[PDB]
Amino acid sequence: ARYLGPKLKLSRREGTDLFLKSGVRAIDTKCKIEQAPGQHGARKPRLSDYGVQLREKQKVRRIYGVLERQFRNYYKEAARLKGNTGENLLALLEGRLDNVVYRMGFGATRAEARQLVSHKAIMVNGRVVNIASYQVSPNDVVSIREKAKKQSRVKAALELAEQREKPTWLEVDAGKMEGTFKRKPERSDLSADINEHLIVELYSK
Amino acid sequence: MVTIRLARHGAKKRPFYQVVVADSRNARNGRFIERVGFFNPIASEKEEGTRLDLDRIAHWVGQGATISDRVAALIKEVNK
Amino acid sequence: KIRTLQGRVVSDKMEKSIVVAIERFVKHPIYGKFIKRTTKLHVHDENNECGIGDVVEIRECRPLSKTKSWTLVRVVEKAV
Amino acid sequence: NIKSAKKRAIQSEKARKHNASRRSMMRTFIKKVYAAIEAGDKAAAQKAFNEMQPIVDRQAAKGLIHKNKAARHKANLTAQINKLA
RNA sequence: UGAAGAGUUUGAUCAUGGCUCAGAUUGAACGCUGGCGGCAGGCCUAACACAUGCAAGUCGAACGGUAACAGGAAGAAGCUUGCUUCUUUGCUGACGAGUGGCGGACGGGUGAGUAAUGUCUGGGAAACUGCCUGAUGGAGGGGGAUAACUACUGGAAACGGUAGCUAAUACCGCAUAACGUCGCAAGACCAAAGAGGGGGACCUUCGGGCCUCUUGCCAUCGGAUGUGCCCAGAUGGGAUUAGCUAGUAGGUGGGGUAACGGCUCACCUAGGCGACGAUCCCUAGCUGGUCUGAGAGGAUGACCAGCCACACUGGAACUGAGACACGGUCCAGACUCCUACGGGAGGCAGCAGUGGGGAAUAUUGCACAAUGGGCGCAAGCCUGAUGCAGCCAUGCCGCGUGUAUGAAGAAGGCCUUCGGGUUGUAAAGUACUUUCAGCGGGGAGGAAGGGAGUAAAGUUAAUACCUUUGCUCAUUGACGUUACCCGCAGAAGAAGCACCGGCUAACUCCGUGCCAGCAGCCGCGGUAAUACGGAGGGUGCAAGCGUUAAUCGGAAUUACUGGGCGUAAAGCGCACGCAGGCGGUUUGUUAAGUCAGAUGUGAAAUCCCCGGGCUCAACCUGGGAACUGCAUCUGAUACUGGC
């Protein structure tokens, strides 16, 4: 099933941008002119502690577009290998193929990157992959499939990705549409403006 | 008789085999005397994808135990 | 080594047998409390130097009759 | 009557009468040694045993009594025949 | 492989005390609703009951034969005069039926019974077994049977009988032989079968000699696995179930049996059992496990493995290596079906389907193509085993219902003294890409193993079987319109459910009006319940979501981890005391308990911890860990126990 909820209203709702309809413009942005509170802010109640957890839980899941039970599987996989449930949980979401295609710059939104996985337009190790939940292996090569390597919207996403900083744990060539995934996401370059002291209170119990 | 045979595992489409010493009486998947290793018909990317103690096979031949043709092909799969 | 027990005669009313009581004298596995736990055996003896109240030493051996497998060795306290 | 098993039933019922007649045949020879023990007569029970061993050895040759009963038929009475012989 | 919190006694507060919620498992069931695939599960109920069909067959390399198909021949002919359908001949291959041996105790199924000396953990000593494996030995002769078949016959039928013919690896006498046994020895008993594939050289009434291989028969005892006998430890509770038994307790003897033993008959002595719960009843298969908890623990032992008991009631014996023989045999009881009235027959707790039952569980399915088991040395045959599809969200896991852009923000709605808000960048417009699907095209892997040729001083006696690292070829598909890819438009065909005042995240507005309708507590509602119905927006989850049932996690409220008895559950009114428990010090001793060292046992699967395999996960699988203990060995020697 798909959420199908709003793209930018949720970014404003928690006061924190989701890289939804906002990743490539600064002018002519269509972002509802950065909506001033009007008579709404004066009528907003305080959230409960049970609700503050849920606001975090939904935010951290929806920024990557992932399923609940898979996000919970990563909460069980972050508990092992001295990984910290508050630290490796983020790197498990960031390490999915549907986000590796995004960080290689092939799509200007996560949904435009997940499009390439879901339409079988991506390959890993030279093999076609349709699984968005795939955990990419270290020192493995990700590339755009032969039948998709001429897309001008991907050349145009790369025209913009050449102007961005890359993750330290991967590389990509804008000509070949190809990159080595060097390492699993690392706390030496991975950071997020999320409540890392609060995500530990989840699934307990 | 006491025989050296492949026990059927791996479930559907990609079977996996445990090489055992067992009695041929009654139940197909009956109790088994001893295991000597494992055999994989599928590529595993490892040079220990199949493992056998050929000296322990020679010790069970030293008990007079029977051999099955599929296990003679397994002894060939470890290049004897 | 063979199994041997010390116990006491609780009935001598039959000629070639003695009823012998043996104990466990050990802690209970979930309470730590000592439990004596007495069990009776119908022990063979055709010597008749012992009787009721005598402390006796018995050994485990082959069945001789229905439910009977233990036999007399010696009198331990020798009170008479 | 559903697995067409009928021939094994007649081969078993034929073997019933036959195996019982194998036992009857050798029991008649044993009966005649315990009758010679009643006869109180000069080596008569030893002579009754000299004709019995070849009837119990044959009845043991395919099965029937060969586990221990034949080795009883050739030893359980061998001190009693020795008396009045 | 590791540790909770929150709602709740009131006018307050603090104890003491019970109640409650977020969570989860399931052969679930019901309703709203339902896109793809794989993997698993799928009559627990009525131990009530069946019409129909299937499910277990097979070997001619044991063989009297020939119901058929090839090939030859003969012939009735057929005619087309050179061959053949015939349809007979058993010759060769081969093979329906029978003889003969094996399989059926495999394959499976039920969980009624059983708190069990059954089951689970671990030990004891005394026996029995086919294939297998080891050791030491044997291979002569005769008498005739007996299906089938042939001619007769009892009967309504099931189901057989009379008389004769016929073979063997089917039967029975005589013989022969220890490893076996009797006779202190001379001596003697008791066995049986071969079958088929190949032949160099040499000889031959060219029949056989001679060579040889694979696989069989008999002799009497070991080994493995299996089976039987004994025992210690472990298993649910209740006494408002208290008395039990006297074939019972101990013993001896006969009889039987594989060993042992009350297994069984007869007799002698006079007990035995219960307090640590016998007797009685209820519930229940047990275990590895399944699920759950940080753990102690709790619930539960389907499906899958390791054992058991059972298959309409009860008793019984026989057959085989193995059967207290589920589809074998006998007999009565019940139930039924058939009857020609004379009698007979039968077992859905194997796979389907049906009747009855029930909340409820599939096709009166496809193939034998791979795998095991069966017959067969191998070819070949059989297989609702096994492989699979059909039907069923019943569970697990991944995955589809596109991506981007598009306005003071349109048409349509909902909130709104009407400022604006919200649906909503949603739509329309445009760009842009097609996964899955549909249809057409191409089409893997599961088809190896065996077989043919080639090669090998294979072993043997170099081209019988069989073996061989290889090479070369004809071959085998239920699933299946497979997987995977290509091609073609075209975003095209693909979404619900419950809830939104507190615990409790989402927010209002309308209707209902103490009536209806909700609820776990709160209590709501007597016409502003955002608490009952609906609408707009929203929350959460999603091919599911809600509801019910059972049982767990919250639970430190059964108590060691980790409580109470003055006043908030309760110290017995008091003393005495049997049975049971505890008990100062010093020097030895034995080494049970104890501690140490070490080995065996602790199945697979499953879990945990760490990895690997198809694009992931489901699924599958390597490693590490534990199974606290139990059994046994060799030491230590303080303290307890024994002395």
Q: Residue B63 and residue A102: Cα distance in Å, rounded?
A: 63
Chains that touch D (3 or more CB pairs under 8 A): none
Fold of A94-180: 3.10.290
Q: How far apart are the first and last CA of chain B?
A: 25
Q: Take residue C36 and report the two structure tokens written for it.
A: 């004596």
Amino acid, res. A26: A
Which residues have C-beta within 8 Å of that of residue B4, sequence separation ≥ 6?
Answer: B19, B20, B21, B36, B57, B60, B65, B66, B67, B68, B71
Neighbouring CB atoms inside 10 A of D5's CB total: 8
Q: Take residue D81 and report the two structure tokens written for it.
A: 């025949």
Resolution of the structure in the document, Å: 9.0
Q: Is the dihedral of CA C59, C61, C67, C73 positive or negative?
A: negative
Which residues have C-beta within 8 Å of that of residue A189, sequence separation ≥ 6?
Answer: A167, A168, A169
Nearest to B24 by CA among B41, B45, B4: B4
CA dihedral A202, A41, A31, A193 (to 10 degrees): -30
Residue numbers followed by a gap, chain A, C–N over 2.5 Å = none
* E13 C1' to A48 CA distance, Å: 27
Q: How far apart are the first and last CA of chain A?
A: 25
Domain A7-93+190-204 has CATH 3.40.640.10: no
**Identical topology for domains A7-93+190-204 and A94-180:** no
Q: Residue B3 and residue D68: Cα distance in Å, rounded?
A: 32
Nearest to B58 by CA among B4, B1, B2: B4
Query: What length does chain B have?
Result: 80
Chains that touch B (3 or more CB pairs under 8 A): none
Buried b (16+ CB within 10 A) or exposed e, B46-79: eeeebebeeeebeebeeeebeeeeebeebeeeee
Please give the helix or strand (H or E) that residue A48 lies within, else none: none
Instruction: Return the bridge partners of C42, or none.
Output: C19
Query: What length does chain D have?
Result: 85
The alpha carbons of chain B give a radius of gyration, in whole angstroms, of: 13
Instruction: Return the bridge partners of A146, or none.
Output: none
Cα–Cα–Cα angle for C29, C32, C37, rounded to 5 degrees: 70
Please give the helix or strand (H or E) that residue D47 lies within, else none: helix D44-50
Instruction: Return the bridge partners of B17, or none.
Output: B8, B39
**Experimentally determined by:** cryo-EM
Buried b (16+ CB within 10 A) or exposed e, A168-202: ebbebebeebbbebeebbeeeebeeeebbebbeeb
Domain boundaries, chain A: 7-93+190-204, 94-180
Q: Which bases of chain E are contacted by protein, using any atom under 7 A from a CB?
A: 2, 4, 22-23, 38-40, 55-57, 99-101, 103-108, 117, 124-134, 160, 172-173, 180-184, 189-192, 218-220, 223-226, 229-233, 249-252, 257-263, 269-274, 276, 294, 304-307, 317-323, 325, 327-329, 345-348, 371-374, 387-388, 397-409, 419-426, 432-436, 446, 449-450, 468-470, 484-487, 491, 495, 503-506, 538-543, 580-582, 603-604, 609-617, 619-622, 628, 632-633, 643
